[model samples]
Target chain A: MVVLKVTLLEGRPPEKKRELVRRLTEMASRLLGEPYEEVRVILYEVRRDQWAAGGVLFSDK
Target chain B: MVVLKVTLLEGRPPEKKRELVRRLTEMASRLLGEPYEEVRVILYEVRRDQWAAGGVLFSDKEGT
Candidate 1:
Protein backbone atom coordinates (compact mmCIF):
# COMPACT_ATOMS: atom_id res chain seq x y z
CA MET A 1 0.00 0.00 0.00
CA VAL A 2 1.24 3.50 -0.77
CA VAL A 3 0.99 6.23 1.83
CA LEU A 4 0.89 9.99 1.44
CA LYS A 5 2.78 11.61 4.30
CA VAL A 6 2.39 14.64 6.57
CA THR A 7 3.70 15.47 10.03
CA LEU A 8 2.34 18.04 12.47
CA LEU A 9 4.60 18.85 15.34
CA GLU A 10 3.82 20.39 18.75
CA GLY A 11 0.43 22.13 18.99
CA ARG A 12 -2.19 22.97 16.42
CA PRO A 13 -5.87 23.75 16.68
CA PRO A 14 -8.30 20.98 15.92
CA GLU A 15 -9.63 22.98 12.98
CA LYS A 16 -6.16 23.40 11.57
CA LYS A 17 -5.44 19.73 12.00
CA ARG A 18 -8.63 18.81 10.24
CA GLU A 19 -7.92 21.20 7.44
CA LEU A 20 -4.42 19.90 7.08
CA VAL A 21 -5.69 16.36 6.78
CA ARG A 22 -8.27 17.27 4.19
CA ARG A 23 -5.97 19.40 2.09
CA LEU A 24 -3.10 16.96 2.38
CA THR A 25 -5.27 14.11 1.22
CA GLU A 26 -6.40 16.16 -1.74
CA MET A 27 -2.91 17.21 -2.67
CA ALA A 28 -1.50 13.71 -2.35
CA SER A 29 -4.25 12.27 -4.46
CA ARG A 30 -3.83 14.94 -7.09
CA LEU A 31 -0.06 14.88 -7.22
CA LEU A 32 0.83 11.31 -6.34
CA GLY A 33 -2.17 9.26 -7.49
CA GLU A 34 -2.75 7.99 -3.96
CA PRO A 35 -6.27 7.18 -2.92
CA TYR A 36 -7.94 8.67 0.15
CA GLU A 37 -8.13 5.22 1.72
CA GLU A 38 -4.42 4.81 1.27
CA VAL A 39 -3.41 8.16 2.66
CA ARG A 40 -1.64 8.04 6.05
CA VAL A 41 -0.92 11.26 7.90
CA ILE A 42 0.69 11.23 11.33
CA LEU A 43 0.85 13.77 14.10
CA TYR A 44 3.75 14.05 16.54
CA GLU A 45 2.75 16.60 19.10
CA VAL A 46 5.55 16.42 21.63
CA ARG A 47 6.14 18.81 24.49
CA ARG A 48 8.06 21.84 23.22
CA ASP A 49 11.08 20.65 25.17
CA GLN A 50 10.75 16.98 24.44
CA TRP A 51 11.89 16.87 20.83
CA ALA A 52 15.35 17.83 19.70
CA ALA A 53 17.10 17.52 16.39
CA GLY A 54 20.20 19.54 17.20
CA GLY A 55 20.39 19.35 20.97
CA VAL A 56 17.77 22.01 21.71
CA LEU A 57 14.47 20.81 23.13
CA PHE A 58 11.54 21.91 21.01
CA SER A 59 9.69 22.95 24.15
CA ASP A 60 12.52 25.05 25.50
CA LYS A 61 11.07 28.29 26.67
CA MET B 1 18.40 5.86 2.04
CA VAL B 2 14.78 6.45 1.25
CA VAL B 3 12.34 4.49 3.41
CA LEU B 4 8.96 2.86 3.19
CA LYS B 5 6.35 3.60 5.81
CA VAL B 6 3.31 1.97 7.34
CA THR B 7 1.11 2.72 10.34
CA LEU B 8 -1.22 0.32 12.04
CA LEU B 9 -3.42 0.61 15.07
CA GLU B 10 -1.53 -0.15 18.28
CA GLY B 11 -2.67 -3.74 18.36
CA ARG B 12 -1.93 -6.49 15.88
CA PRO B 13 -0.60 -10.02 15.88
CA PRO B 14 3.16 -10.24 15.99
CA GLU B 15 3.10 -12.23 12.75
CA LYS B 16 0.78 -9.81 11.01
CA LYS B 17 2.82 -6.90 12.25
CA ARG B 18 6.01 -8.51 11.04
CA GLU B 19 4.52 -9.15 7.64
CA LEU B 20 3.31 -5.62 7.29
CA VAL B 21 6.68 -4.22 8.19
CA ARG B 22 8.55 -6.57 5.88
CA ARG B 23 6.34 -6.01 2.89
CA LEU B 24 6.18 -2.30 3.42
CA THR B 25 9.94 -2.04 3.56
CA GLU B 26 10.31 -4.08 0.41
CA MET B 27 7.68 -2.07 -1.42
CA ALA B 28 9.31 1.20 -0.46
CA SER B 29 12.72 0.00 -1.49
CA ARG B 30 11.49 -1.28 -4.82
CA LEU B 31 9.06 1.47 -5.69
CA LEU B 32 10.60 4.47 -4.10
CA GLY B 33 14.42 4.62 -3.86
CA GLU B 34 14.20 3.99 -0.14
CA PRO B 35 16.40 1.51 1.63
CA TYR B 36 15.19 -0.95 4.21
CA GLU B 37 17.17 0.84 6.88
CA GLU B 38 15.66 4.17 5.96
CA VAL B 39 12.07 3.07 6.23
CA ARG B 40 10.35 4.66 9.19
CA VAL B 41 7.05 3.18 10.26
CA ILE B 42 5.12 4.50 13.21
CA LEU B 43 2.05 3.20 15.01
CA TYR B 44 -0.54 5.17 16.93
CA GLU B 45 -2.98 2.79 18.49
CA VAL B 46 -5.68 4.75 20.20
CA ARG B 47 -8.42 2.85 21.97
CA ARG B 48 -10.84 1.77 19.28
CA ASP B 49 -13.40 4.04 20.89
CA GLN B 50 -11.06 6.95 21.35
CA TRP B 51 -10.43 8.00 17.77
CA ALA B 52 -12.81 10.53 16.29
CA ALA B 53 -13.33 11.56 12.74
CA GLY B 54 -15.67 14.50 12.11
CA GLY B 55 -16.46 14.46 15.83
CA VAL B 56 -17.82 10.93 15.71
CA LEU B 57 -16.13 8.36 17.90
CA PHE B 58 -14.47 5.59 15.92
CA SER B 59 -15.87 3.18 18.43
CA ASP B 60 -19.33 4.65 17.79
CA LYS B 61 -19.97 1.83 15.28
CA GLU B 62 -20.74 4.15 12.38
CA GLY B 63 -17.36 5.83 12.20
CA THR B 64 -14.69 4.56 9.87
Candidate 2:
Protein backbone atom coordinates (compact mmCIF):
# COMPACT_ATOMS: atom_id res chain seq x y z
CA MET A 1 0.00 0.00 0.00
CA VAL A 2 1.17 3.54 -0.65
CA VAL A 3 1.73 5.82 2.31
CA LEU A 4 0.54 9.43 2.12
CA LYS A 5 2.93 11.61 4.03
CA VAL A 6 2.58 14.97 5.78
CA THR A 7 5.08 16.89 7.87
CA LEU A 8 4.58 20.04 9.91
CA LEU A 9 6.80 22.08 12.17
CA GLU A 10 5.83 21.66 15.82
CA GLY A 11 4.49 24.50 17.96
CA ARG A 12 0.91 23.74 18.86
CA PRO A 13 -0.39 22.40 22.15
CA PRO A 14 -1.27 18.72 22.67
CA GLU A 15 -5.00 19.11 22.03
CA LYS A 16 -4.49 20.87 18.71
CA LYS A 17 -1.87 18.36 17.67
CA ARG A 18 -4.22 15.47 18.45
CA GLU A 19 -6.96 17.09 16.42
CA LEU A 20 -4.65 17.59 13.46
CA VAL A 21 -3.65 13.96 13.49
CA ARG A 22 -7.23 12.77 13.68
CA ARG A 23 -8.37 15.01 10.83
CA LEU A 24 -5.44 14.15 8.64
CA THR A 25 -6.02 10.46 9.20
CA GLU A 26 -9.68 10.76 8.35
CA MET A 27 -8.95 12.61 5.13
CA ALA A 28 -6.28 10.20 4.04
CA SER A 29 -8.41 7.21 4.89
CA ARG A 30 -11.21 8.57 2.70
CA LEU A 31 -8.87 9.33 -0.18
CA LEU A 32 -7.19 5.94 -0.09
CA GLY A 33 -10.47 4.02 0.05
CA GLU A 34 -9.02 2.13 2.95
CA PRO A 35 -10.41 1.44 6.38
CA TYR A 36 -9.09 3.63 9.13
CA GLU A 37 -7.11 0.68 10.47
CA GLU A 38 -4.97 0.56 7.35
CA VAL A 39 -4.02 4.21 7.47
CA ARG A 40 -0.92 5.35 9.33
CA VAL A 41 -0.46 8.91 10.48
CA ILE A 42 2.95 9.48 11.96
CA LEU A 43 4.06 12.64 13.70
CA TYR A 44 7.37 13.90 14.98
CA GLU A 45 7.21 16.53 17.67
CA VAL A 46 10.35 18.62 17.58
CA ARG A 47 11.37 20.74 20.48
CA ARG A 48 12.39 24.35 19.78
CA ASP A 49 16.06 23.74 20.50
CA GLN A 50 16.16 20.64 18.34
CA TRP A 51 14.62 22.33 15.32
CA ALA A 52 16.65 24.56 13.01
CA ALA A 53 16.07 26.14 9.65
CA GLY A 54 18.26 28.53 7.69
CA GLY A 55 20.89 27.74 10.34
CA VAL A 56 18.70 29.22 13.06
CA LEU A 57 16.46 27.70 15.69
CA PHE A 58 12.81 27.72 14.63
CA SER A 59 11.80 29.78 17.65
CA ASP A 60 14.38 32.47 16.81
CA LYS A 61 14.88 34.61 13.73
CA MET B 1 19.10 11.74 -1.11
CA VAL B 2 16.39 10.15 0.98
CA VAL B 3 15.78 8.79 4.45
CA LEU B 4 14.80 5.31 5.69
CA LYS B 5 12.33 4.99 8.53
CA VAL B 6 10.43 2.28 10.43
CA THR B 7 7.94 2.51 13.26
CA LEU B 8 6.49 -0.01 15.66
CA LEU B 9 4.35 0.08 18.77
CA GLU B 10 5.61 0.87 22.28
CA GLY B 11 4.72 -2.29 24.18
CA ARG B 12 7.59 -4.50 23.06
CA PRO B 13 10.33 -5.22 25.56
CA PRO B 14 13.02 -2.58 25.40
CA GLU B 15 15.60 -5.14 24.30
CA LYS B 16 13.58 -6.46 21.39
CA LYS B 17 12.65 -2.95 20.38
CA ARG B 18 16.25 -1.87 20.54
CA GLU B 19 17.31 -4.85 18.49
CA LEU B 20 14.71 -4.13 15.86
CA VAL B 21 15.81 -0.52 15.64
CA ARG B 22 19.48 -1.46 15.46
CA ARG B 23 19.00 -4.10 12.79
CA LEU B 24 16.76 -1.85 10.74
CA THR B 25 19.26 0.95 11.08
CA GLU B 26 22.14 -1.27 10.06
CA MET B 27 20.37 -2.49 6.95
CA ALA B 28 19.34 1.00 5.95
CA SER B 29 22.80 2.34 6.64
CA ARG B 30 24.38 -0.29 4.44
CA LEU B 31 21.86 0.19 1.69
CA LEU B 32 22.14 3.99 1.79
CA GLY B 33 25.80 4.30 2.94
CA GLU B 34 24.67 7.00 5.35
CA PRO B 35 25.71 7.19 8.97
CA TYR B 36 23.31 5.80 11.55
CA GLU B 37 22.86 9.24 13.02
CA GLU B 38 21.55 10.64 9.74
CA VAL B 39 18.63 8.22 9.57
CA ARG B 40 15.49 9.13 11.49
CA VAL B 41 12.97 6.69 12.98
CA ILE B 42 10.03 8.07 14.84
CA LEU B 43 7.65 5.97 16.95
CA TYR B 44 4.43 6.61 18.84
CA GLU B 45 3.00 4.43 21.56
CA VAL B 46 -0.73 3.98 21.27
CA ARG B 47 -2.22 2.93 24.53
CA ARG B 48 -4.41 -0.13 24.36
CA ASP B 49 -7.53 1.94 24.80
CA GLN B 50 -6.57 4.61 22.29
CA TRP B 51 -6.26 2.44 19.19
CA ALA B 52 -9.22 0.83 17.45
CA ALA B 53 -9.44 -1.21 14.30
CA GLY B 54 -12.31 -3.01 12.59
CA GLY B 55 -14.27 -1.25 15.33
CA VAL B 56 -12.16 -3.03 17.93
CA LEU B 57 -8.97 -2.29 19.78
CA PHE B 58 -5.87 -3.96 18.33
CA SER B 59 -4.74 -5.28 21.67
CA ASP B 60 -8.04 -7.03 22.15
CA LYS B 61 -7.68 -8.72 18.80
CA GLU B 62 -3.98 -9.11 18.02
CA GLY B 63 -2.57 -9.02 21.54
CA THR B 64 -0.68 -5.93 20.46
Candidate 3:
Protein backbone atom coordinates (compact mmCIF):
# COMPACT_ATOMS: atom_id res chain seq x y z
CA MET A 1 0.00 0.00 0.00
CA VAL A 2 1.08 3.59 -0.56
CA VAL A 3 0.86 5.58 2.63
CA LEU A 4 0.76 9.40 2.55
CA LYS A 5 1.08 11.43 5.71
CA VAL A 6 0.34 15.18 5.91
CA THR A 7 1.19 17.64 8.65
CA LEU A 8 -0.32 21.12 8.97
CA LEU A 9 -1.35 23.72 11.49
CA GLU A 10 -4.56 22.72 13.29
CA GLY A 11 -8.01 24.22 12.70
CA ARG A 12 -9.54 23.05 9.42
CA PRO A 13 -12.97 21.42 9.55
CA PRO A 14 -13.18 17.64 9.26
CA GLU A 15 -14.70 17.69 5.79
CA LYS A 16 -11.59 19.35 4.38
CA LYS A 17 -9.39 16.66 5.83
CA ARG A 18 -11.62 13.97 4.43
CA GLU A 19 -11.36 15.50 0.97
CA LEU A 20 -7.62 15.71 1.26
CA VAL A 21 -7.27 12.04 2.04
CA ARG A 22 -9.71 10.95 -0.60
CA ARG A 23 -8.12 12.93 -3.40
CA LEU A 24 -4.61 12.04 -2.36
CA THR A 25 -5.59 8.37 -2.36
CA GLU A 26 -6.95 8.73 -5.86
CA MET A 27 -3.90 10.57 -7.12
CA ALA A 28 -1.48 8.09 -5.62
CA SER A 29 -3.49 5.24 -7.08
CA ARG A 30 -3.40 6.77 -10.53
CA LEU A 31 0.23 7.80 -10.48
CA LEU A 32 1.66 4.72 -8.82
CA GLY A 33 -0.76 2.42 -10.60
CA GLU A 34 -1.86 1.16 -7.24
CA PRO A 35 -5.45 0.14 -6.52
CA TYR A 36 -7.61 2.73 -4.86
CA GLU A 37 -7.87 0.53 -1.80
CA GLU A 38 -4.11 0.20 -1.70
CA VAL A 39 -3.56 3.91 -1.18
CA ARG A 40 -3.80 5.28 2.36
CA VAL A 41 -3.48 8.79 3.76
CA ILE A 42 -2.94 10.14 7.26
CA LEU A 43 -3.11 13.72 8.50
CA TYR A 44 -1.26 15.32 11.39
CA GLU A 45 -2.09 18.76 12.76
CA VAL A 46 0.71 20.66 14.45
CA ARG A 47 0.38 23.62 16.73
CA ARG A 48 2.10 26.91 15.88
CA ASP A 49 3.87 26.85 19.21
CA GLN A 50 5.71 23.68 18.32
CA TRP A 51 7.13 25.04 15.07
CA ALA A 52 10.20 27.22 14.72
CA ALA A 53 12.23 28.98 12.00
CA GLY A 54 15.59 30.72 12.11
CA GLY A 55 15.58 29.70 15.79
CA VAL A 56 12.37 31.67 16.30
CA LEU A 57 9.25 29.82 17.39
CA PHE A 58 6.15 30.24 15.22
CA SER A 59 4.21 31.32 18.26
CA ASP A 60 6.64 34.12 18.75
CA LYS A 61 6.22 35.48 15.26
CA MET B 1 18.46 9.57 9.21
CA VAL B 2 14.86 10.67 9.26
CA VAL B 3 12.71 12.18 6.54
CA LEU B 4 9.32 13.78 7.01
CA LYS B 5 6.92 14.66 4.24
CA VAL B 6 4.03 17.02 4.88
CA THR B 7 1.17 17.76 2.47
CA LEU B 8 -1.45 20.45 2.91
CA LEU B 9 -3.84 22.72 1.01
CA GLU B 10 -1.88 25.60 -0.50
CA GLY B 11 -1.79 29.04 1.15
CA ARG B 12 0.02 29.00 4.44
CA PRO B 13 2.27 32.05 4.86
CA PRO B 14 5.77 30.94 3.80
CA GLU B 15 7.15 31.77 7.22
CA LYS B 16 4.86 29.23 8.80
CA LYS B 17 6.07 26.47 6.54
CA ARG B 18 9.66 27.43 7.11
CA GLU B 19 9.08 27.17 10.83
CA LEU B 20 7.41 23.81 10.37
CA VAL B 21 10.35 22.29 8.54
CA ARG B 22 12.86 23.71 10.93
CA ARG B 23 11.03 22.48 13.99
CA LEU B 24 10.23 19.08 12.57
CA THR B 25 13.89 18.68 11.72
CA GLU B 26 14.81 19.60 15.26
CA MET B 27 12.29 17.32 16.89
CA ALA B 28 13.14 14.35 14.73
CA SER B 29 16.81 14.84 15.34
CA ARG B 30 16.28 15.12 19.08
CA LEU B 31 13.88 12.21 19.41
CA LEU B 32 15.68 9.91 17.01
CA GLY B 33 19.03 11.17 18.29
CA GLU B 34 20.26 11.74 14.77
CA PRO B 35 22.39 14.67 13.73
CA TYR B 36 20.25 17.76 13.10
CA GLU B 37 21.59 17.99 9.56
CA GLU B 38 20.59 14.40 8.91
CA VAL B 39 16.90 15.08 9.46
CA ARG B 40 15.02 16.28 6.39
CA VAL B 41 11.52 17.63 5.83
CA ILE B 42 9.63 18.27 2.65
CA LEU B 43 6.34 20.12 2.26
CA TYR B 44 3.74 19.85 -0.48
CA GLU B 45 0.83 22.21 -0.95
CA VAL B 46 -2.28 20.94 -2.72
CA ARG B 47 -5.17 22.79 -4.19
CA ARG B 48 -8.72 22.46 -2.93
CA ASP B 49 -10.13 21.31 -6.26
CA GLN B 50 -7.58 18.54 -6.36
CA TRP B 51 -8.88 17.11 -3.11
CA ALA B 52 -12.14 15.23 -2.52
CA ALA B 53 -13.90 13.03 0.03
CA GLY B 54 -17.19 11.15 0.12
CA GLY B 55 -17.60 12.27 -3.48
CA VAL B 56 -17.27 15.90 -2.41
CA LEU B 57 -14.45 18.25 -3.38
CA PHE B 58 -12.98 20.73 -0.96
CA SER B 59 -13.45 23.52 -3.49
CA ASP B 60 -17.13 22.68 -3.52
CA LYS B 61 -17.47 23.53 0.13
CA GLU B 62 -19.38 26.68 1.05
CA GLY B 63 -16.39 28.48 2.52
CA THR B 64 -13.47 26.50 1.20
Candidate 4:
Protein backbone atom coordinates (compact mmCIF):
# COMPACT_ATOMS: atom_id res chain seq x y z
CA MET A 1 0.00 0.00 0.00
CA VAL A 2 1.14 3.53 -0.73
CA VAL A 3 0.66 5.80 2.26
CA LEU A 4 1.14 9.48 1.48
CA LYS A 5 1.50 12.19 4.09
CA VAL A 6 0.44 15.68 2.98
CA THR A 7 1.26 18.59 5.28
CA LEU A 8 -0.58 21.91 4.86
CA LEU A 9 -1.72 24.96 6.77
CA GLU A 10 -5.16 24.93 8.34
CA GLY A 11 -8.33 26.77 7.09
CA ARG A 12 -8.35 25.81 3.43
CA PRO A 13 -11.74 24.97 1.97
CA PRO A 14 -12.88 21.36 1.74
CA GLU A 15 -13.33 21.38 -2.02
CA LYS A 16 -9.70 22.16 -2.80
CA LYS A 17 -8.61 19.71 -0.18
CA ARG A 18 -10.54 16.96 -1.92
CA GLU A 19 -9.08 17.99 -5.27
CA LEU A 20 -5.53 17.87 -3.90
CA VAL A 21 -5.89 14.44 -2.31
CA ARG A 22 -7.39 13.06 -5.49
CA ARG A 23 -4.50 14.34 -7.58
CA LEU A 24 -1.89 13.22 -5.09
CA THR A 25 -3.36 9.76 -4.84
CA GLU A 26 -3.45 9.45 -8.59
CA MET A 27 0.11 10.70 -8.98
CA ALA A 28 1.46 8.43 -6.29
CA SER A 29 -0.27 5.37 -7.72
CA ARG A 30 0.90 6.11 -11.22
CA LEU A 31 4.52 6.77 -10.32
CA LEU A 32 4.82 4.02 -7.77
CA GLY A 33 3.05 1.49 -10.03
CA GLU A 34 0.54 0.72 -7.31
CA PRO A 35 -3.18 0.26 -7.78
CA TYR A 36 -5.24 3.37 -7.16
CA GLU A 37 -7.24 1.62 -4.47
CA GLU A 38 -4.09 0.91 -2.49
CA VAL A 39 -3.15 4.58 -2.33
CA ARG A 40 -4.03 5.93 1.10
CA VAL A 41 -3.85 9.68 1.38
CA ILE A 42 -3.44 11.27 4.80
CA LEU A 43 -3.67 15.05 5.00
CA TYR A 44 -1.95 16.63 7.98
CA GLU A 45 -2.95 20.19 8.89
CA VAL A 46 -1.05 22.52 11.19
CA ARG A 47 -1.83 25.87 12.73
CA ARG A 48 -0.14 29.09 11.60
CA ASP A 49 1.80 29.28 14.84
CA GLN A 50 3.35 25.90 14.02
CA TRP A 51 4.81 27.14 10.79
CA ALA A 52 7.71 29.55 10.30
CA ALA A 53 9.56 31.31 7.55
CA GLY A 54 12.84 33.20 7.83
CA GLY A 55 12.96 32.52 11.59
CA VAL A 56 9.58 34.20 12.10
CA LEU A 57 6.34 32.43 12.90
CA PHE A 58 3.64 32.76 10.24
CA SER A 59 1.08 33.68 12.88
CA ASP A 60 3.06 36.76 13.84
CA LYS A 61 3.47 38.01 10.33
CA MET B 1 20.98 19.74 5.62
CA VAL B 2 18.98 16.80 6.95
CA VAL B 3 15.25 17.28 6.55
CA LEU B 4 13.75 14.88 9.09
CA LYS B 5 9.99 14.50 8.89
CA VAL B 6 8.59 12.82 12.00
CA THR B 7 5.02 11.57 11.80
CA LEU B 8 3.21 11.22 15.14
CA LEU B 9 -0.14 11.09 16.88
CA GLU B 10 -1.91 14.09 18.39
CA GLY B 11 -1.79 15.37 22.01
CA ARG B 12 1.95 15.29 22.48
CA PRO B 13 3.01 17.85 25.10
CA PRO B 14 5.15 20.79 23.99
CA GLU B 15 7.91 19.89 26.45
CA LYS B 16 8.32 16.35 25.12
CA LYS B 17 8.18 17.64 21.56
CA ARG B 18 11.00 20.07 22.26
CA GLU B 19 13.18 17.34 23.72
CA LEU B 20 12.66 15.07 20.70
CA VAL B 21 13.60 17.84 18.33
CA ARG B 22 16.74 18.63 20.27
CA ARG B 23 17.71 14.99 20.53
CA LEU B 24 16.85 14.24 16.91
CA THR B 25 18.85 17.21 15.75
CA GLU B 26 21.88 16.10 17.69
CA MET B 27 21.76 12.50 16.51
CA ALA B 28 20.95 13.43 12.93
CA SER B 29 23.86 15.84 12.84
CA ARG B 30 26.32 13.42 14.37
CA LEU B 31 25.37 10.34 12.38
CA LEU B 32 24.95 12.20 9.10
CA GLY B 33 28.07 14.29 9.72
CA GLU B 34 26.44 17.70 9.38
CA PRO B 35 26.02 20.73 11.57
CA TYR B 36 23.20 20.40 14.09
CA GLU B 37 21.94 23.91 13.37
CA GLU B 38 21.38 23.07 9.73
CA VAL B 39 19.14 20.11 10.48
CA ARG B 40 15.43 20.83 10.11
CA VAL B 41 12.73 18.89 11.90
CA ILE B 42 9.14 18.85 10.66
CA LEU B 43 6.58 17.28 12.98
CA TYR B 44 3.37 16.03 11.39
CA GLU B 45 0.74 15.38 14.02
CA VAL B 46 -2.58 13.94 12.86
CA ARG B 47 -5.82 13.63 14.75
CA ARG B 48 -7.43 10.31 15.67
CA ASP B 49 -9.93 10.54 12.83
CA GLN B 50 -7.09 10.94 10.38
CA TRP B 51 -5.51 7.76 11.66
CA ALA B 52 -6.73 4.21 11.33
CA ALA B 53 -5.70 0.71 12.26
CA GLY B 54 -6.74 -2.19 10.03
CA GLY B 55 -9.39 0.02 8.41
CA VAL B 56 -10.78 1.04 11.82
CA LEU B 57 -10.29 4.68 12.78
CA PHE B 58 -8.78 5.54 16.15
CA SER B 59 -11.48 8.11 16.80
CA ASP B 60 -14.17 5.46 16.46
CA LYS B 61 -12.27 3.09 18.71
CA GLU B 62 -11.91 5.57 21.57
CA GLY B 63 -13.88 5.27 24.85
CA THR B 64 -13.29 1.56 25.10
Q: What TM-score fits each model?
A: 0.42, 0.42, 0.48, 0.54
Per-residue lDDT of model 4, residues B1-64, tens digit only: 6677767887877657666766777777788898755676666678888999899989888844
Q: In order, what lDDT does every prediction score?
A: 0.56, 0.58, 0.72, 0.75
Ranking by TM-score: 4, 3, 2, 1
Candidate DockQ scores, in order: 0.03, 0.05, 0.06, 0.10
Clashing pairs in 3: A19-B52
Maximum-TM-score candidate: 4
DockQ of the two-chain complex in candidate 1: 0.03
Q: For model 2, name the residue pairs that clash.
A: none
Q: Give the runs in model 2 whose Cα sits over 4 Å from its true position.
A: A1-61, B1-5, B59-64
Q: Write model 3 residue lDDT over B1-64, tens digit each, in one string.
A: 6667677887888677776777777777788888865665555567899888898889998463
- Which ten contiguous residues of candidate 1 chain A have the minimum total lDDT? A49-58
Residue A34 C-alpha lDDT in model 4: 96
Model 3 segments beyond 4 Å from truth?
Answer: A1-61, B62-64
Q: Global lDDT for candidate 3? A: 0.72
In terms of lDDT, the best-performing candidate is 4
**Best-first order by lDDT:** 4, 3, 2, 1
lDDT of 2 by residue, B1-64 (tens): 2343333344666455455555666676678886656654433445666778689886787664
10 residues in a row with least lDDT, candidate 4 chain B:
B35-44
Q: How do the residues A1-61 of candidate 2 rate in per-residue lDDT, one tens digit apiece?
A: 4355555566778898778778877988888888887777677664443333322333443
lDDT of 2 at A35: 85
